[PDB]
């Protein structure tokens, strides 16, 4: 069973530049050595087998170099689409193993969250429960804090919070914030206000409401 | 069928010529050997020719190549009796290690047949 | 014998039990091994390539069930079983592949008749 | 062109055996052969063995030769994959995928088919209109959300205006809680655009047969 072991694990880079990411097979394979990229969400599409061949289709951004042990990919020109995980796969002799992939993040300009929130629907009212929601939308870096203040204290109980993945229209990042307690505590308190703290600003992004108040 | 050939038995007399015809649907197989099988023996290779090439000669055995048409032909120049047995046709994807076996034309050389 | 010593030949395999074979490369130059099957109605079949020592692999086919091991640098047997199928079973020796023009030739044993009749 | 269109999404219960397929099109199904690859929490790739529709021989990744069992129908031009046994680590992500006959190098791929490996009691979700505060001020665009509380198991299925509103959208990953999920959306069109045009963000679940179109409404 052979072992393939992927570097860095992770890496970003503007668009028009060059990175190379290297695989290390755990004995000697020869040039049976094939790259993919995954896009989150989807599956993993085809770019180089036989360790430089370039799959059918596959843009020239792409090459691939190397042998016996030690190879390696190099995407020049970075293009907004080639954000993903990249994946090593030994094809010489079963069972063929997967490099535990590489992550390519794309840096570009930053972006100030597009913060907006949103009261307990009346739905989930009528049930018992009480959401607030709010999604800080496109934003670069990737780092966001967000802080909910219940009317002016802070709250740590009741956040779950999701990240979308880099977007490829624009490379951009997303993320959501919810904030669930009852109807009784929701009803009990007027302010609802959400934080992000973003390296664009030094000044919070804050976006509330009045439970009261429509 | 990767690799396709035709016929699947030809008898000729001895003297005629042979044309053993074959086809492979993936574009990107490189190497295209014939082999030659006599009766209780193991598969002996008898031409071959690379994909970079339209034709393929040793005295009197003879490929024809169509990359483009992804078409390859086998003829048996001068026909002897020694020539009755089986020829596969076969391909090789670039970088293999395997050959994927056409099922192989029955050649009988010299017949009024039983030989 | 010349680049390939095949052992058996025509073995006769009883039904539940498992005929074994192994091949002896001869000349050093074509470390690359195959071991291929040729069925009743004379089709050849790649079944697999162990290339180095200590590499076994495994397959199993309608009428042969079989497990191949290339032992060290000369040996390599294989073990077909569940055969319902009688069929000549051939080893096979080539350089080691060109990853361009790829034309190394392929040698193959004299094979091993699994019978059946 | 080539298509691999697989099975759907699958929950069954510890023991059981679910079979996956993968109806191959836009190319000749004999002459290659059907890889399986499991991914599993969205991590690190698996190859489960593979089949060859013509000689019909198959090899085994040398852990899921015990459970897995590989198939073809050549008529339908169709791939299985029957998982006998499921144990709670089966649960991932599995992919049919095409390959040659001596590189094992992937060609094409299936879709994915997420098979849950549970105990848990099949839940569906509950829909809300998620709307902008209030007002129907400016600001020239306005954000619409849609969130989906409380399901089990994974696979769902979020669309707004059935796909006719592809852009302008993010849904985001669901997130385990308590045993069950809290997946969420997010759309923003122009302030022209609603409330005038209607927009409904619509979830399915197969794992309980769920049609949910909720219109989003003002206050």
């Known amino acids: 069973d052979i072992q393939m072991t992927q570097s860095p694990a992770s890496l970003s880079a503007s668009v028009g530049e060059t990175v190379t990411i290297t695989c290390r097979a755990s004995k000697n394979i020869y040039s049976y050595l094939a790259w993919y990229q995954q896009k989150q969400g989807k599956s993993p599409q085809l770019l180089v087998y036989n360790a430089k061949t370039l799959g059918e289709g596959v843009p020239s951004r792409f090459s691939g170099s190397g042998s016996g042990t030690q190879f390696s990919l190099k995407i020049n020109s970075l293009q907004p689409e080639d954000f993903g995980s990249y994946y090593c796969q030994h094809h010489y002799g079963t069972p063929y193993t997967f490099g535990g992939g590489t992550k390519l993040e794309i840096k570009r300009a930053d972006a100030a969250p597009t913060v907006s929130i949103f009261p307990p629907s009346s739905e989930q009212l009528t049930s018992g429960g009480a959401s607030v929601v709010c999604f800080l939308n496109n934003f670069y870096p990737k780092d966001i804090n967000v802080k909910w203040k219940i009317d002016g204290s802070e709250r740590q109980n009741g956040v779950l919070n999701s990240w979308t993945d880099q977007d490829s229209k624009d490379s951009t990042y997303s993320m959501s914030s919810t904030l669930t307690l009852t109807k009784d505590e929701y009803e009990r308190h007027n302010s609802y206000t959400c934080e992000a703290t973003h390296k664009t600003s030094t000044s919070p992004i804050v976006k509330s409401f009045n439970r009261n108040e429509c | 069928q990767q690799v396709r050939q035709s016929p699947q038995s030809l008898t000729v007399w001895e003297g005629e010529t042979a044309i053993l015809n074959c086809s492979y649907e993936?574009?990107?197989?490189?190497?295209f050997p014939w082999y030659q099988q006599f009766p209780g023996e193991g598969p002996a290779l008898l031409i071959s020719?690379?994909?970079?090439?339209d034709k393929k000669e040793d005295g009197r055995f003879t490929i024809f190549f169509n990359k483009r048409e992804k078409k390859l032909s086998l003829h048996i120049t001068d026909s002897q009796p020694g020539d009755s047995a089986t020829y596969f046709c076969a391909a090789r994807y670039q970088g293999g290690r395997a050959l994927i076996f056409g099922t192989g034309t029955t050649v009988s050389v010299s017949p009024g047949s039983a030989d | 014998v010349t680049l390939l010593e095949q052992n058996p030949r025509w073995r006769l395999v009883p039904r539940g039990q498992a005929v074994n074979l192994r091949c002896i490369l001869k000349?050093?130059?074509?470390?690359?091994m195959s071991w291929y099957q040729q069925d009743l109605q004379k089709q050849l079949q790649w079944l697999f390539t162990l290339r180095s020592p200590g590499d076994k692999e495994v397959k199993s086919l309608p009428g042969a069930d079989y497990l191949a091991t290339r032992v060290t640098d000369t040996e390599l047997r294989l073990q077909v079983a569940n055969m319902s199928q009688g069929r000549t079973l051939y080893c096979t020796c080539?350089?080691?592949?060109?990853?361009?023009?790829?034309?190394?030739?392929?040698?193959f044993g004299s094979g091993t008749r699994l019978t059946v009749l | 062109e080539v298509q691999l269109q697989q099975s759907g999404p699958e929950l069954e219960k510890p023991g059981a055996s679910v079979k996956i397929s993968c109806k191959a099109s836009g190319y000749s199904f004999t002459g290659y052969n059907m890889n399986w690859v499991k991914q599993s929490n969205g991590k690190s790739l698996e190859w489960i063995g593979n089949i060859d529709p013509y000689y019909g021989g198959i090899s085994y990744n040398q852990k899921f030769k015990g459970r897995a069992t590989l198939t073809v129908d050549k008529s339908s031009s169709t791939a299985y994959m029957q998982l006998k046994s499921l144990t709670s680590e089966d649960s991932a992500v599995y992919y049919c995928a095409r390959s040659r006959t001596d590189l094992y190098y992937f060609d094409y791929w299936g879709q994915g088919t997420t098979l849950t490996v549970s105990s848990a009691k099949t839940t569906a979700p509950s829909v809300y209109p998620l709307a902008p505060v209030c007002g129907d001020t400016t600001g020239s665009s306005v954000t619409l959300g849609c969130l989906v509380k409380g399901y089990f198991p994974e696979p769902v299925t979020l669309t707004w205006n059935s796909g006719s509103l592809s852009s302008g959208v993010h849904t985001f990953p669901a997130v385990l809680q308590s045993d069950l999920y809290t997946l969420s959306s997010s759309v923003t069109v122009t302030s022209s655009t609603w409330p005038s045009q209607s927009i409904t963000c619509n979830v399915a679940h197969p794992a309980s047969s769920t049609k949910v179109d909720k219109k989003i409404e003002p206050r």
């Open positions: 993936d574009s990107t197989f490189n190497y």
């Open positions: 000349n050093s130059q074509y470390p690359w």
């Open positions: 020719i690379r994909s970079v090439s």
């Open positions: 080539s350089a080691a592949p060109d990853w361009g023009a790829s034309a190394e030739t392929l040698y």
